[PDB]
């Protein structure tokens, strides 16, 4: 069943419920929230890349009864987030993690793996 989002960074982003394990392999929201903490500086700083939406689509995926399996952000979203926050990442000496490899995500118009675009 779906559960309310407890991950502070993913509250109030336009869907209310997620379900664990997430797309990152986290057993619980507390574990997910901890792994997400390294991204907190980048998310407050506005790198205009929809980083919050992208991260939360993977760390706190939307859950509804309408769909069985999670719908992650599309690859193009991963890539635009990576590029737009790339300079501010150089300043904080933050390297984009191997776990967020954008090549892993589907893009739009794959009928078997749906993905989300940003609101």
């Amino acid at each position, epitope marked *: 069943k779906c559960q309310p989002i407890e991950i502070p960074m993913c509250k109030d982003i336009g869907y209310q419920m997620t379900r664990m394990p997430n797309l990152m392999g986290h057993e619980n929201q507390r574990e997910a929230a901890i792994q997400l903490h390294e991204f907190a500086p980048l998310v407050e700083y506005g790198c205009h890349g929809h980083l919050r939406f992208f991260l939360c689509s993977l760390y706190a995926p939307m859950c509804t009864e309408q769909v069985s399996t999670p719908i992650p952000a599309c690859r193009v979203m*991963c*890539e635009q987030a990576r590029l737009k926050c790339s300079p501010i990442m150089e300043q904080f000496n933050f390297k984009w993690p191997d776990s967020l*490899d954008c*090549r892993k995500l589907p893009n739009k*118009n*794959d009928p*078997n793996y749906l*993905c989300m675009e940003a609101p």
Partner: antibody, heavy 126, light 107 residues
Framework: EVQLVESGGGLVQPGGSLRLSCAAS????????MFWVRQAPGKGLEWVAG????????NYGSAVKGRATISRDNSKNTLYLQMNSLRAEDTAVYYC???????????????????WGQGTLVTVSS | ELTQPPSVSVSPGQTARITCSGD????????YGWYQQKPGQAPVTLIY???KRPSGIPERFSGSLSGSTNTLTISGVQAEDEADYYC?????????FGGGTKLTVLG
């Protein structure tokens, strides 16, 4: 050094079925995405299917989607391909191929295949 | 959609350039690998992740991404580089290969 050895090639009638397996050795199999790639006689490489480390997000090329199942058994370091309703134009050398990275949420890209099998020939004919 | 010239000619010691073009209108990033294949053999990987060379591949092979195009450059071409060359990448429909370039070494 990586070895990928395919088997299961042979002759099949149109509308028949194929089952390929690939035995992988030399590397930590369960940490890498694996692919099937095929080549019809005198033609180019065609990506057939791909599967992630755990076996959880199989995807397929256009020509085989809906007729194909890619799977793996990590306990036996073995990758499998199953295909139905075979067409003559499915005649091809089928290659087992190992990716240089692991993980997928349904997406695959053929930018880092780093080991190739020797291929096994499937002949589709009456 | 992934596009390669079907054929290229070089004479020995010269530089050959083989390109793979994808969808320039795409708003994200691109990734290419290059695979060499000789008649009757399996492919051999020359370049992965746009510009990385496996150890054991001669230094005269290199790749580089510009825009939506990746170019394989073979400097100082040898007769033993005569082969078909395929880029590996992704279409709008998923993982995919280019149609292949036949590279002829003259003389």
């Amino acid at each position: 050094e990586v070895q990928l050895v395919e088997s299961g090639g042979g002759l099949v009638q149109p509308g028949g079925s194929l089952r390929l397996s690939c035995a992988a050795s030399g590397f930590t199999f369960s940490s890498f995405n694996m692919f099937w790639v095929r080549q019809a006689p005198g033609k180019g490489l065609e990506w057939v299917a791909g599967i992630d480390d755990d076996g959880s997000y199989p995807n397929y090329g256009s020509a085989v989607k809906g007729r194909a199942t890619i799977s793996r058994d990590n306990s036996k370091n073995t990758l499998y391909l199953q295909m139905n309703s075979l067409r003559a134009e499915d005649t091809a050398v089928y290659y087992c191929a190992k990716s240089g990275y692991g993980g997928s949420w349904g997406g695959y890209i053929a930018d880092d295949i780093d080991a190739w099998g020797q291929g096994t020939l499937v002949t589709v004919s009456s | 959609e992934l596009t390669q010239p079907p054929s290229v000619s070089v004479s020995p010691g010269q530089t050959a350039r083989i390109t793979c073009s994808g969808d320039g209108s795409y708003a994200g990033s691109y990734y290419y690998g290059w695979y060499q294949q000789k008649p009757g053999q399996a492919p051999v990987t020359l370049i992965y992740y746009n510009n990385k060379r496996p150890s054991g591949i001669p230094e005269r092979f290199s790749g580089s991404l510009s825009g939506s195009t990746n170019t394989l450059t073979i400097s100082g071409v040898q007769a033993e580089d005569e082969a078909d060359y395929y880029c590996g990448s992704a279409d709008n429909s998923g993982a995919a290969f280019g149609g292949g370039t036949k590279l002829t070494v003259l003389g």
